[PDB]
Each structure stands twice: as C-alpha cells, then as structure tokens.
Curated annotation (Swiss-Prot), chains C, E:
Gene name of this polypeptide: clpP
Organism the protein comes from: Staphylococcus aureus (strain MW2)
Pfam families per the UniProt record, alphabetical: CLP_protease
NCBIfam families assigned: clpP, PRK00277.1, PRK12553.1
Protein's UniProt name: ATP-dependent Clp protease proteolytic subunit
Family under the similarity heading: Belongs to the peptidase S14 family.
SUPFAM superfamilies cross-referenced by the UniProt entry: ClpP/crotonase (SSF52096)
Enzyme Commission number(s): 3.4.21.92
UniProtKB/Swiss-Prot annotation, chain G:
Uppermost EC category: hydrolase
Keyword Calcium found: no
NCBIfam families: clpP, PRK00277.1, PRK12553.1
UniProt EC number: 3.4.21.92
Protein name: ATP-dependent Clp protease proteolytic subunit
One of the Pfam families matching this protein, by short name: CLP_protease
Subcellular location: Cytoplasm
Annotated Gene Ontology cellular component terms: cytoplasm; endopeptidase Clp complex
UniProt cross-references to InterPro entries, sorted A to Z: ClpP, ClpP/crotonase-like_dom_sf, ClpP/TepA, ClpP_His_AS, ClpP_Ser_AS
UniProt GO molecular function: ATP-dependent peptidase activity; ATPase binding; identical protein binding; serine-type endopeptidase activity
Keyword hit for Lyase: no
Quaternary structure (record): Fourteen ClpP subunits assemble into 2 heptameric rings which stack back to back to give a disk-like structure with a central cavity, resembling the structure of eukaryotic proteasomes.
Curated annotation (Swiss-Prot), chains I, K:
GO aspect biological process, one term: protein quality control for misfolded or incompletely synthesized proteins
InterPro entries: ClpP, ClpP/crotonase-like_dom_sf, ClpP/TepA, ClpP_His_AS, ClpP_Ser_AS
Keyword terms, alphabetized: Cytoplasm, Hydrolase, Protease, Serine protease
EC annotation from Swiss-Prot or TrEMBL: 3.4.21.92
Xref: Gene3D superfamilies: 2-enoyl-CoA Hydratase, Chain A, domain 1
Function, as annotated: Cleaves peptides in various proteins in a process that requires ATP hydrolysis. Has a chymotrypsin-like activity. Plays a major role in the degradation of misfolded proteins.
GO molecular function, one term: ATP-dependent peptidase activity
Principal location listed in the UniProt entry: cytoplasm
Full protein name: ATP-dependent Clp protease proteolytic subunit
Residues of the signal peptide: none
Keyword Lyase: no
Gene Ontology annotations for the cellular component aspect, listed alphabetically: cytoplasm; endopeptidase Clp complex
Amino acid sequence: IPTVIETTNRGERAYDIYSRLLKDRIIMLGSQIDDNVANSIVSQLLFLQAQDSEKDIYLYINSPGGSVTAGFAIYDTIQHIKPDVQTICIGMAASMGSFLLAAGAKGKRFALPNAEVMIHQPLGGAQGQATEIAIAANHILKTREKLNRILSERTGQSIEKIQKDTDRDNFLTAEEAKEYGLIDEVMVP
Amino acid sequence: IPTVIETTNRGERAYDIYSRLLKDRIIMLGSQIDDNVANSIVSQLLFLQAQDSEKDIYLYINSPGGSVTAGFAIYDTIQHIKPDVQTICIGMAASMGSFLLAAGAKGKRFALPNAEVMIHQPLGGAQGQATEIAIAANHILKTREKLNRILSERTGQSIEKIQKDTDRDNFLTAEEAKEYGLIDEVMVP
Amino acid sequence: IPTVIETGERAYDIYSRLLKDRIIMLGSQIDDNVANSIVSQLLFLQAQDSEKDIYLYINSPGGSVTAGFAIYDTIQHIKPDVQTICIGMAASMGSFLLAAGAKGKRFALPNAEVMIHQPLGGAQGQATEIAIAANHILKTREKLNRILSERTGQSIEKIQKDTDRDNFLTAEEAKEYGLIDEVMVP
Amino acid sequence: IPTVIETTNRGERAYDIYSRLLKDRIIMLGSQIDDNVANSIVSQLLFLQAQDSEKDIYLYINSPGGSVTAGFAIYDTIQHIKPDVQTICIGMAASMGSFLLAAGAKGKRFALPNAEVMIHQPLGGAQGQATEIAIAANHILKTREKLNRILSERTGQSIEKIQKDTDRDNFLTAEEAKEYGLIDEVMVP
Amino acid sequence: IPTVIETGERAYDIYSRLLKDRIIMLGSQIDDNVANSIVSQLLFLQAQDSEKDIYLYINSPGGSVTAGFAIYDTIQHIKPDVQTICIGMAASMGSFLLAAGAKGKRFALPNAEVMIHQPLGGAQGQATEIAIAANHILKTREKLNRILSERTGQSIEKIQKDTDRDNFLTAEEAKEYGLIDEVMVP
Amino acid sequence: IPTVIYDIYSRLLKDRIIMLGSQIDDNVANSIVSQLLFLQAQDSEKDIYLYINSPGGSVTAGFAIYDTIQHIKPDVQTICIGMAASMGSFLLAAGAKGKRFALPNAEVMIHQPLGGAQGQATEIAIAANHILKTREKLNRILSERTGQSIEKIQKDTDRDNFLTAEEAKEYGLIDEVMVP
Amino acid sequence: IPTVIEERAYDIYSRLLKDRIIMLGSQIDDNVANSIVSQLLFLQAQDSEKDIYLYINSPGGSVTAGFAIYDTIQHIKPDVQTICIGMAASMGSFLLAAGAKGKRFALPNAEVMIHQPLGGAQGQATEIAIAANHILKTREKLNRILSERTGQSIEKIQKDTDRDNFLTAEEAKEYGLIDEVMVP
Amino acid sequence: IPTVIEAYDIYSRLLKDRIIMLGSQIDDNVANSIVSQLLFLQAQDSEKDIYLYINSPGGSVTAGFAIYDTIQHIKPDVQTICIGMAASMGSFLLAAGAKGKRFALPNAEVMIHQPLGGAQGQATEIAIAANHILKTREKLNRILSERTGQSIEKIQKDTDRDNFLTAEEAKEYGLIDEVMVP
Amino acid sequence: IPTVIETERAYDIYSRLLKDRIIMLGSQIDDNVANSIVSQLLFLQAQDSEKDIYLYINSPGGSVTAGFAIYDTIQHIKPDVQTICIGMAASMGSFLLAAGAKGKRFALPNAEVMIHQPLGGAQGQATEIAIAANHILKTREKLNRILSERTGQSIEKIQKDTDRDNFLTAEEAKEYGLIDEVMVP
Amino acid sequence: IPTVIETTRAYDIYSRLLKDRIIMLGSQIDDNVANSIVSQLLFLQAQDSEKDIYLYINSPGGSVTAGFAIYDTIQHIKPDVQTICIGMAASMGSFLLAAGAKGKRFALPNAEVMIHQPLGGAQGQATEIAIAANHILKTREKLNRILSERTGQSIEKIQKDTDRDNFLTAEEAKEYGLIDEVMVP
Amino acid sequence: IPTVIETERAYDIYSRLLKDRIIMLGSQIDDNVANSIVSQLLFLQAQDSEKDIYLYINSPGGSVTAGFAIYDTIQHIKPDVQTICIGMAASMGSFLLAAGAKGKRFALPNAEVMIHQPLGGAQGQATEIAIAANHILKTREKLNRILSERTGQSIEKIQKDTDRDNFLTAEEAKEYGLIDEVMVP
C-alpha cells in the first residue's frame, strides 16, 4: 500500500492511496463485506456528505460479498445521505456486493465490460433445539423476502423471477446485468 | 471387560459378560445410542426372538441419548417382535433413552428408586442456503411432532402437555416418571 | 458386539449368528469395506442355498455411489430373493438399496424414515478436469434416476424434481412413492 | 482504515476517519461489545463532554452484542454525562446492542428503514462445585432482572412481557422496534 | 492382564478368575461404560447363587454420579450381600459406593484413604438453561446427602458442612464417621 | 482506538483521567503506575480520576498499582463502571476516602486469590503458605479501607460474592453511588 | 467382518477363499498386494486346474503393487477370472483387463476408469529427470500391456488415458477391457 | 521497506515517477492497490505513459480482470514489462499492455495455462461451477486471441497443460512486442 | 489377513505359506520385519536343513542394519534360499534379492529393481558429524563390496551406478548380475 | 532496524546507505526481496545513470525466477553494478555475484561462495511431471550457459562442478572466475 | 523500546547510541542481525572514519556465515572497532569479541564467555553427508586459525579447548587472550 506526498502552504500531506482517492470522493470496497468493513464504508459516506452534500460519490466495488447485516448498513446509508452515489463494479460483485451494486443512484450504476456479477440466496446456519432452528429458519426466509423485495424495486424484475433466478448461484455477464436492471451502463473503453 | 467360562459335555464355552447375560435374555444398553449401538440391539432382539418367541426379554437402560433415527429402529423392532420387552432404567435414561424406556411392554416398565429420567426436544443443525435450512427446519419439527405423538400414546399425557414439558431439559425422579406414565413401577427394595 | 455359543462348540458373534438365519445387517455408512462385506455375505448365502430368501435390514445414512452399486448389482446377480427391510433411516444410497429389494418384498417399519437426494461429489484443478468431473457425476445422476424409475414406477423427470434437494419421506409416503411395497404392522 | 488530513493554523492535522467523525460529535460502534470496545466508547463519551457539555452526541450502532458488563459501562456513562445522546441503529443491533440503542436520549432514538433489532436473554457459564454453580446461576438471574427492569423503564413494556419476549431469539424490524418502544422514529430517506 | 488356565481348556484373565470366587474389581474412573461392567457382573453373580456373599474391591478416584447410582441401586436390588473393601483410594462417588455395602461388611485396609466432596457439574448457554442445570445439581447434592445420612448415621447438616470442600479421611476416621464398619487388620 | 497523528486515552490523560479497561497483568500495571508517576509530576496537588472496569488479575500487579496510589501526593478518585472484580474491587477500595464511586448499575465482586503449585511436598508447602499469607495481606488492607473486620471479610470472600453499587456502599467498598 | 462355522471357524473372506474366490475391495498398497499374491499362491497349491475368481471393486493404488498381482496371475497355472463390481479404476482397471482371455466380466452398473499413472518428484534438476524418465517408462509399460490385452493400439490408449476416462461396463466391453457384461 | 519517514518507501518513490510494481500473487488486495494506483496516476496526468513491472505467479482471475479493465478504461498508455516470471494471470496482464509497449527482459519467463477451479456439493452445483469456469476459459482465450493475433483454436490447444515460453518465444507468440536488450 | 483351516490347524494366510517353506516380505524393512524374517529362517532350518526356502520380495527397502540381519542369516543357515522379486525390489530390497542362493535368484517379467546409495543423517558438533560421515561411507563400501561379489560387477562400476537412483527392469537386473533368471511367462 | 536522522528527515540505515548508492542483499531471494532490489536499482538509475552501484551480497539463495529479475535488471540499467560478497553467497546468490560489472566483482577474505544445481518439485500425472522436468532442465541449461559465459569455464565443467554442493573459498572463486579481486585488508 | 527526543529528532534508544557511534548486539546472530550491523558499520565509516566505534556484545551466537560477515567488515573498515562484552558472549559472540581492534577488547567483571565447536547438520545420501562433513571441518579449521592469530594461542590448543563447551570467567578470557582488559570499577 503506497504513500502519496502532497504539498500545501502549511506542510506535507502523507496519503496512503485509498485516502488520496477519498479526497476525490472515491470509496473502494475491495474486500469481503463484514462489520469492520461496513463501519469503514459508512464512515466514509458520512464524512463525504459533510464535506460537500451536493457532489457525487463513486463507490468502486470488487467484493465476494459477506454479511447481509453489514450490507444493509451500507445500503441504508446510501439511501439516506444527500449526494448521489455512483457504483462501479470492477472484476466481481457477488451476492451482497451485487446488492450494493444495484443500490447506486438511478442511471449511475456501471460495470466494466469484463466485470462478473453473481446473485444467489443468502447463507445461514443453526444448531441446537427444534424451536431454536425454527426461529433461525424463519429469520433467514424473512431476510430472503426483504432482499428479493428491494431487488425488485431496484431492477424492475418481479419478486417471483428474482426468487427463481437466485435459487442457486447465478453468474451474470456485465452485459447481462444491464438486461437484468442491476446496472444501467457498461463502461466501454 | 471380564469373561465367564461354562462347561458343556462337548467342550468349553467362553462368554464375555454381556454374552452370558444375553443367554438369559438380558440386553444391556449403557452408552450413547448411535447407529452401531442400534445395530447391535436390533440384532440382539432378533436373535432372542429366534430362540424363544414366547419368553420375555429384559432391556436395562443407562443411556444419555443419541441419534433419534437410531432410537426408532430399536423402538419399532421392540414393537415388531412377539416377546414382551421389559424395560428397566438404572442410573440415567435421557433424551432418546427415556423415549425407549417408555417403549417397554405396558405393565413391565420399571425404574430403580434413584434412577434419573430426562425428557427434552430433539437437537439438530443446518448450514447453507435459506431453502436448505427451511428443509432442515421443517424436518426437525416433523420429528418433534412424531416423538410427541408416540410419547403421548404411551404415557397417557396429551400432546400439548408433552410439548410444554419438553421445551427445555426436564429432570424427573423415578416416582415422578411413574406419576407421568413413563414407567409403571419403581422397583424396590 | 456380543457372542453366542452353541453345540465342538459353535462360537458366533451376533451378526454371524444372524447370518446363519440368512439375515444381513447394513447398519452403517456405505463405504468400500462395508460394500465388500455385504457383497461377500450375499455370495456366501447364495453358495449355501440359492432358493431361500435373504433378509437385508437397512439403517444407513448412505455413502459412496460406487460402493452402493456393487451391492445393488450383487442383489440382482444372485438367485435368492433379497427382502429389504428399512429400520430407522434409509438415506441417499440406503434408500436406493431399499428400493432394490426383490419386488413385492420391500418393507418398512411404521416409523422408518426415507430420504432421496442428489449424489454428492467434488472436483479441483484445471477447467477441463472440472468438466470431466461434472460430466461424470451428471452421468451417474441419470443412471441413478433411471434405475430408480424402473423400480418405483415413477417417471425419470419426477425423480429428478423430487431429488433436487433433500426429500424426507414417511413410510406411508415411501409406499405411495414406489420405494417400498408394504409398511410392517404391528 | 483511511485517513483525513486537514490544514490548520498550527499545521497539518491527520485524523483517522473515526477521529474526523469524533470532531463532529459522532461515535461509531461497529463490533462486538467487549472490555476494550467499552473502554473506547466510554472514553469518547468522556472526551466529548469535556469539549462541549451542551451539543448533542450521535452514537451509531451496528453490533452483535457482547458483554453485559461492558454494555452496562457504556449505558451508565450515557446516563451520566450532561449532553443528550442520540442513538441511530444501522444494520443490526442485537442483544446488548439493542439495549444500548434503547439507552438513547428520549425522543432521539432512531433506526434506518432496513435495520434489524434483536432481543434475547443473557448467556453465561459455570463449572465445578454444586454451590459454585448456584452462585453463578443466582448472579445470572439477578442480571436478567436488572436488564429487564431497565428495558422496561426505557421502553414502557412490562417486566413480564420482556421476559416472555426474550425467552428465545426475537427478531424485530425497525417498525416493530418503534411499536415496542425500543426506538422513537424510523428515519425515512 | 495375564492368563490363568483350567484343565478342553479354560482360558481366563485374572479378573475373570477372581470373578469365579465372587470378587469384582472396581479399580478405575467411574463412567457409564464401567458402571456397565459392574452391573452385569452383579446380575450374573446373583443368577449363579443369590445367597453367597459378593466381594466389591474399590480403588476409584470417582466419576459420574448417575453411573454411581446405577451401581449403587443394583447392590440394594439383589439378594446377596455385597461386601465393599476399600484398597488404595476411594474418592467421591467411589466413597459413596464404599458406604453402600451391606451393614457390618464395609471394610478398608489400614492405609486406604477416603474422600468426600461436593458433586461437580457444568452449565453453558442461556440464563434459563443455567437455572435448570443449577437446580438439577442442587437436587442431586441433596439425594447424595440424604442417602449418605442413612448410611453413616451422620445428620444431613454435618454432611453438608463436611462435603463443602474436599475432605480426605483416614481409614480410622471413615470408621468414626460411619463410612466403613471396620479397618481390616492383618 | 480513535487516533490523531494523540490516541483517545492520551487525550483523557491530559485531563488527569486514567482508564483501567482490562485484566491486570504486569504490563497494565506498568502502564498505570507510569501514568500515576507522570501525572503526579505535571501537578502534585490536582486530583486524579481512575475509572475501573476490570475482571482483575495478578495480585502482585494490583499491588504495584495500590502502593503507587498511596505513595504519590495527589488524591486518586476511583470510579467503578460496569464491573470491578477481585483485584479490580480491591483497587476500587484503594482510592482516597470520600472519593470512591460507582455508577448506579456497576457491579462489584470480592473473593479469594487463586494460584498454583506442582512438585515436591515441601515446594507445595512453600507455595501454600505464600498464598495463605497474601490472603491475610489482602484481608488486612480491606479491613483498614472498608471498616469491616478481618473476620467478616474471610467469611465474605470465601466464595465469589457479588455486590450491587448500593451494597458496595453499605459494605464500605465505595463512599457514594454516583447519580443521575 | 462376520464369522462362519463348520468345528471350523472362518471370517467371510476366508470362507469364500475355500470356494476359490478372492475379493479385492480396497486401495492397492503393498499390504493388499502381499495378501492377494499369497492367496493366489495358496490356491494354486490347493489345486492347479480349477479356476480362480477375482472380484474387483478398487480405486487403484500403487502401480508397482498392481504388477505384483499382475505377474503372479500370469505365472500360476489356473485361469483367473476377473469380475468388476462397482468400481475398477486406475490400476484396478488394468488388473481387471489382466484376467484370463474369455473370462473378464463386469456387472451392468460397474464403472471402469483408465488414466495415466501418478507420481512426484522433489529435489534437484537431475533427481527430477530420473523420476520423470522413470514414470514415463512405466506409462509405456502399462500402455504396451493394455495394448496386448485389449487389442487397441498404443496410440489410442495413449490418448484415451491423457485425462480421466470413465467407461460404462458396455463401453469397457467394446473397448476390450472385458469380455462380457454379466446379465441379469 | 526501505523507508524514509519524512512511511515513504521504495515503491512510493517509484510511483512518483509513474512506476507501478507488481511482484506478488494477484488477489483482491493486490488488485485494489493496483487499480487505485492506476486511477491515482490518471488523475495526476492523463497523457503520460505508465509502467507496470510484472513479476507474478498470477492468482485470481477476477482480480486480474479488475486490473485489465482498469488498464483499458483509463486514458494514458500502460506499458507492461515482465521481469523474471509472468505466469497464468500475470502473462495475461502482460499481454494486456498498450500495443507496441509490452516488454520482457531477455531471461524473463512467461507461462500460459488453463484457469484453475474447485467444486464441492450436489451434482447440480458442480454442473453450475463447471459451466462458469468453462465460460471464463472462453473469455480469457477470446481476449488473448485479440491481444496476440493467434486464434482461439491455437490458444485453446496451447493452454491445455502448463506452457513455458521464453521471452523470445513470447514475442513470436505475440504476448510481448519486444525483448528489452541491454 | 484371511484364514485357512486344515484338519484343527488354523493358519492365517502367511502362516500357511510358511508351512510350504515360503517367506513373504511385502513391506519396508525395519527391526520388526527383520526380526520376523530371521525367526522364520531359523525356524525353517530347524524343521529341515536340506529343503529349499522361497523368499518373495516386494520391498521399498528400509534400514541398512536390518537388511544385514536378514542377509547374514541367509548365508549362515544350510538350506538354499531362493529369492523371487515380485513388483519392486528397491534399495535394501534389491540387496536381499541379490543375496539368494546362487543360480536361484528370480524376478517376474514386470518386476522393477532399484539400486541407490544408503540414506542417513547427522546433527550436532563438527566432530560428531565427521563420525557419522565416516560411518556411512564405511557402510557404503560394505554394501558395494558385497554387491560386487554377488554380481560379478566391479566395485568401481557399482560406485558409479548407484550415485543416484537407478531403475533396472527384471531383464536389466538379469544382465547386471542381480538375478539369475527372469521367470517367464 | 535503526534510524538515522538528517537536518536541512529520518532514514533507515538501508535508505541512508542507498543515498551512497549501496544496496544490501542480506537474506533469501524470493519475489518480495527481488521486487525491493529491482526497485532500488531503478530508483538509483533515476538519481544518476553515471555513478556506480554497490550491491553487497549475503544470501543463501532461493527462487531462480526472482534471481533472474535482479540479474536482468542489473544488465539493463546504465550504471555499473559492483557486487561484494561478505559472509555467504549460495545458489542464486552466487549467480548474482558473478553478475557484477567487469573487474568489479569482489569478495571479502572469509566470504564463502557456493554453487549448485537448481531445486524443484512436480506432482500429478506423468505428462505434468514431464512438463515440470523439462522446464527445470531448460532452466539448468540457461543458468549453466550464463555462468559459462561469465566465469569463462565450459558448460560441461559448470554442469559437473554444480552437480552437488560445491563450497568455494574466496581465493578459489577468483580462480574459478566468479569474482575478480579478493578485497584486502 | 523507548524513544528519545531532540529539538524534532525522534530517536529510538538504539538509534541515539548509533549517533554516538555505539552499536548494540543483543540478540542471536543471523542473516538479518548481521545485515543490520554491517549496515551500521558502513554508515559510521562514511560519517567519520577516524573516530572509534563501540560494538557492545551480548550474544549466544548463531550462524557462522553471519558472524564472518561482521568479522570481515570490521577488519575491512578504517576506524578501530572496540568490542565490549556485557553479560554473555557465546560461540560466534566470543569470536566477534576476539575480533576487536588490538588493545581495545574489553569485558565487564562478571561477563561470561563460552567457546566451542560449530554445530551443523546433514540429511540425505552418503555423498551428500560427506560434502557437509567436509564443509564443517574446513569451517572449524578456519575458525581455529583466525582465533589462533587473534589470541596468540596455538591451533592444537584451541583445538583441544573447544572440543566440548568451554565456559570462561572474564579474567580467564584475558589470560586466554580473547579480551585485552577487564573493565573495572
């Protein structure tokens, strides 16, 4: 992770690259989505709204996904702050990472021509008693419905198509993610 | 570990202790009930029936429980054979061990005065996709129903009451198990 | 694992005493060792008497498809009828072997469970090694369903739907399905 | 974890992102609650009070819960300081996270529309002597009560309802969290 | 475990040869598996002759409460008198079994020690699951105190005081206390 | 760890505040003593605030802190938040008279020290006598600081004993329960 | 592992051994190989005219251990019938093909797999060349025999074993690995 | 490593001259750094060349494409220089450089091969995994076919097993444009 | 380990072969295997000192020292010991093979034979390392000398030929002097 | 690793030494270390393509690939690169030692130099092993070739002298032509 | 490790002593430690090649190959290098002690010095073990010879005295001539 040195009339600014890009309102979501990661992303979003609440934000996405709970943390913060958030998928947006992909501002969800996108149903787990397991099964189906509902609004697909398409891992080409409504444009070079 | 050696007109007979008890139609269950334990007990019942379809069998029970699947194999085998299986609880009959205790021939279900009986829900687990967890949830619920149903038929208790009393670990004195209908007699002196 | 002695002195362990009455016990996962033993017992029992029925009590969670076919093909191969009796649970290959009992003589105890599902595999390595492996297991799926079809009376396309994920069956349901012929009462 | 560098009279001050947010009286809680996280929140609270005992504090919560003891440290300190503390749940506030969400200054507890809240009874352990197990059991029941007592004060549901409702895992949406009185408003975009 | 022989040919191990003389050696940790061995021997022995005394040598550090009662209850159940003899050590559950022998026939060798203490347990999970466990292990402390009161002559209250922490007794102090009837002199 | 390039404990330290938010081991005690000596050095009359949320730890490391509190010139206020257990509770009690506090929901626990011994009968006799001796040292100082007798303290610490903030005040472990 | 009693007391595999049946139901290592060879030597000693039946359900194993069995089969006088049940793969498949001409069977759902040998080399450049030359030399020994035993050219066997190749019992018959599929 | 705290390390010194060093396995973190460095450099100056040195065993196909598409997306030319080894995904990134500006040093090595996968589970899930990795092989081949001039058929054959190319055979293959002579 | 029952002798399989004077070596050679072979050889002599004994070999080899245990016992006893290699005779496996009775050392047509240096190791002081070094070079001469006598091949050739692993075919081992005849067909 | 501070600014001792055009290679050579060396080389070129570079070498060696990254870079840049062996230059470290500028390859009196064959590994199918074997043999030919050209020895001689571990005295490496002078004192 | 500040120079403690020409060797000697010391020595020579250098020694030792790198650099540089043993200088650590500038090798009154043979190891073929055994003896000779020159003791005597571990009191290291003066008070 390189450092960039910037000079001001007061002294030297030492920026690691992600922090220099963050000065141009660029957020890089480059790993698995978990709590520490959500906390980082949400904080960057809150910081940038403060700096300027009228300028776009660029959320670059290369994530194999992760926690649904952490993704909603991100999602909700996107839907809540004042400036538009463009999302660029580079490489891979799978599961929750493709969810945030579809969560960018209308007209402003991009993917590079070779970016891959995956939609699937969420993974959970339960041990112990018959009632414990039933509580956990009901919770996960409930969050399945929530995810399908929101995706529907975002893509324009019917909940029932989404339900069938996410039944097993479904890999989408950048061009197929446009047909699907997950992204708006494929950024051609 | 020990051995008993017997004399027959035409040679000698070396029996491990459980084998010498089997000859008198006594079966010992003193472990967790996995498939192996199940396979051995079913074999033993089938053998004892093949010797004398009339004479009683004795199944002593000191078992903390195990595979639900392996309980029913024993249970149904006990119901299938012609001889009356007398169930005697020594020490601890827990989980699927008390279920098996209740399976004994009616009138011939016993406990020693200081023997413990525990009844609870079955345990389980699922990992993976939402619809896989739903399948595992539905299944475990269906076997709770199935167990409640058989327990009800044998104890004289209602399904609702068994449903409440098994919600968490429930410990029963031998006389409490007598008063619940899990056993017939507390064997003194 | 108990012993039984009878009159030198015929000293048997419990399963071997049951073999004398033509009873085979499959009460564990089906791996290659278990297959070899069952197969061996089946051959032994044929050599003793090719006319008298054989009784295969089943309580198995399943295992190696390959090891399951060895048993399946041996049952088909020998002369004596092989009755299958499901006790407890017959899952994956267990249920498939259950269905392989001699026609009219496939039984279940009242609280026996049955489960049918897809075979389970794995592949690692080069793209074309993965291809070879996918193609192999899909080819064995077809093989499984076709035999399962013949023996249940169900269509190839129904077994495909019904085994797409874990499908837990009641004894009555398994009779309805074609996997067993009778539920044993009492 | 990214850095922000500001230009001041004195020179060039570089903050980590969470420290830039602290200057705006924002506190972020994104992890489990353990003795270190406790100490850190507490300290940020003692720090903000020192800077301005009048202006509101904003505490964002996305946490799977944790230590009853560390949670209570945070709780007591919110009550102790003069400035109002607004709690905003994003993503997940579970067990002690949700208790803390409820600890917000009345009229000023929020959730984003897809945030989840979970209430359960506390978890613990005990080993060794019968009378050592009793001391651990008595203590966990005393804290269960202390937890219920306060939740009741904070929510307006009774001590007996919370006891029934927290017996197993209980998943609430934000809208149900408003009905339960765990939060005041659901923030809409 | 060496072999003895009786002239077919009777091949024994030492415990099996002592078993012929009605001696049962309990010389290890008390788990369900070991309670099994001991219950069976007792049942077998009652079957061979319900009058002749049975000898229970005890060298155990303790073990499962429920495995202990299994043994304890079977001694009371069967007709023949069980003579308990404490060699080496008998701690906790093994000292409860020591005191469990027929009246007048609980013995210990001059240098045997005996230990009485609280039953040990463990609870994990939710507050309500900790309650159920806590109550269960208070209920079994009482049973053990209760029974031990009848067996020693000591009151419930002294036994509560006396089992609080570990408490090692001399063979002579176990006689005073009422755990054994006599210290066996050469 | 909210950080400026001052971390957050370093900012509170500037206001004479010391946080004890972990097990008491050598390093923690080193850190805390070091802070005590340093704060004494910036100003020897101004109060010190010592917050405690500590499961406890090394008797020895606790003592380094105890004697450092009594040794320096300024008063050290102890404020229990969350839980102060075993050596934490001792440290809570170790603050200046009139200035030992607990927040209304804080919990205190007192007990015996724990320890170990392996090997030869006499090596075990040395370790045994050592632990029995440090128990009396703890029980003695707790008597001088609570107002309870050394006979009532042995009674009370024999097993894990949990006190409420109000019961800690009844008992003399603290002077006040801090409100609101 | 059940017991049978005649008063003589065998385990099932030893009972079957009396009827001249050998079962090969495991990986082929040196121990399994040691035990088959011995069985075949014993059976020859018993009677040299009577056939021997080798039942096969094995995923393979050591090439060098397969050859012990292979060579022992060729060397003894009685004809060894090989029967594939379940799976005969890698070196197992080769041994199946090693049965007496006209006496190589498979059951209808048995599977056959043929592929390259597998090996390893660590160390210096020249130690790796020795291992490479060696394993290539064994690949050709295998091919050449499969060719003598199936009728297929060395060129064809070379290709058809480049990656894992799964055969139905019917394809194994068409290929020459076996003589008959055992119906019914 | 090695450091001026002014931390201002050697790679930071090189970035100042528009040199990006890739000397490790390609995973998400490495890709992120690379992409970020590529975006950073564009923002600085849009018409000056960028130098990406490649000494990589390769790695994640997905991480590789991130860099690839970033290279195609931005405005300035990205020269690729292979040093030592550029294998599987690395060789793909080598081929990815601006046309006429892809280099290798005389002793550098290049290896091309199939993508590497895995698959556990039900028959159907294995089928899904196979189809995807076959779809990613076609995709790699097809791009490499544009990039090299060689056809889809040749590339397919030539990537069947590990294929080790010298720098001079890499020029002949059209993977690089020139061998950097001293 | 299958059983064979005669009439009431109950020899397991290798024991029944021992009855026909057959000794099976089918594993690594270490102290247990060696001790077993020796005991078998001594037993067999006792029974009858004229009749040939047949030792089948399929060994990856093993301990040099355990190899000599076997070798020396073979020479010592009075019966001829014919060595048949089946499958693999590597290292100390092929030494033993070459040690059978002259004119009576065989290999089946597809058997492989590997000859190589002995492997060893040394940790510790410089002086301790030299002691271990000189030992292993001495046992290398010991093996090479015996090899020469048993093959007719010069000690110089054996020194070159075993520098790295050498993989002979049965037919090559025949040429080399390691076996007398290849057992066709 | 100790700091040095300058005024006009803290430095590593290593980047202090880099201000004097000194590069230290004091460890095993894998990609990370090569990367760092290459980068140091390219930086020093940017700072002046005229003045020489001092590359001290204390390495047990490592990756062939990573070594060749350094070797080629040294060849490529404009300035002369002096190589100085202190302590140990083994395997790929000694290949890089003989890679210094003409007349500018040195060793200290007690530096040891070791040359040997490259090491590798291969697992899987015969063909995958053949591919592996052939690639590593191709890298032997490459190494030997470049050594032959620089040391003045013949390919056939370098092959024999690197067959196993060859430890060379500093004087002996001057004889062999790996270095030019032995630095004295 | 604590920080020192100058009005702003933020030195870590070792880097403040490097300012006063003091180098601290406290750990085991390996390729990294040796690379740091060599780097520190080169640096100090460029700053002032006339002023003394102070190498404080407290080490169990480690790699011979690492130590010799430090050894060769000390002799090679212009400044005199004083070596002071604090606590312990074992094996390679005592060798460096003996390597200080004449008249300037010191020890603290309670400093302990141990000398012995180098340790090594070898696994593999007979010839592999011989090559290792050879290298280590050549290493032992070399060590012995350099220790002989520097203490003024014969090769035969150093040979005997280092056979097993030899612990020397601070004063005995002076008679034996490893150090020059023992430093009071």
